[PDB]
Amino acid sequence: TKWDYKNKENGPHRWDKLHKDFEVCKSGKSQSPINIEHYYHTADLQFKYAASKPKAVFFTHHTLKASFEPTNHINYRGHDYVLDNVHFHAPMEFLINNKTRPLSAHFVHKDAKGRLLVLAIGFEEGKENPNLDPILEGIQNFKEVALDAFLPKSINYYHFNGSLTAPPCTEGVAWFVIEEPLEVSAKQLAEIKKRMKNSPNQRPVQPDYNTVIIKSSAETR
Ligand X SMILES: NS(=O)(=O)c1nnc(NS(=O)(=O)c2ccccc2)s1
Chain contacts with a second copy (rule: CB under 8 A): 24, 27-30, 38, 40-42, 44, 76-77, 79, 113, 115-117, 159-161, 170-174, 207, 209-214
Under 8 Å between Cβ of 35 and 97: yes
Does 89 belong to an annotated binding site? yes
> Using CB distances below 5 to 8 A depending on partner kind, what does residue 203 bind out of Zn ion, Cl ion, a second copy, none?
none
Tell me which residue of 101, 1, 111 sits closest to 61, measured CA to CA: 1
State phi, psi for 89 to the nearest 5 degrees.
-130, 135
What does each C-alpha distance from 160 to 15, 127, 184, 195, 206 come to in angstroms?
A: 23, 31, 27, 31, 14
What does each C-alpha distance from 176 to 53, 137, 213 come to in angstroms?
A: 25, 28, 10
Dist CA 221 CA 210 (whole Å) = 33
Site for Cl ion in 147-206 (CB under 5 A): none
> Which of 85, 129, 188, 202 is in the footprint of ligand X by CB under 6 A?
85
Does 19 belong to an annotated binding site? no
Helices of type H across 163-217? 186-195
Question: Minimal distance in Å, beta carbon 127 to ligand X?
Answer: 26
Cα 10 from chain centroid (whole Å): 22
Under 8 Å between Cβ of 74 and 119: yes
68 binds Cl ion (CB under 5 A): no
118 binds ligand X (CB under 6 A): yes
Annotated active-site positions, please?
Answer: 62
Which of the stretches 77-85, 99-107, 155-163, 199-207 binds Zn ion when contact is defined by CB under 5 A?
A: 99-107
Tell me which residue of 209, 169, 172 sits closest to 14, measured CA to CA: 169
> Which of 108, 151, 177, 182 is in the footprint of ligand X by CB under 6 A?
108
> Using CB distances below 5 to 8 A depending on partner kind, what does residue 104 bind out of ligand X, Zn ion, Cl ion, none?
Cl ion
92 binds Cl ion (CB under 5 A): yes
Q: Which residues bind Cl ion (CB under 5 A)?
A: 92-94, 104, 120
Binding residues for Zn(2+): 87, 89, 93, 106
Binding residues: 87, 89, 93, 106
Q: Which residues bind ligand X (CB under 6 A)?
A: 84-85, 87, 106, 108, 110, 118, 164-166
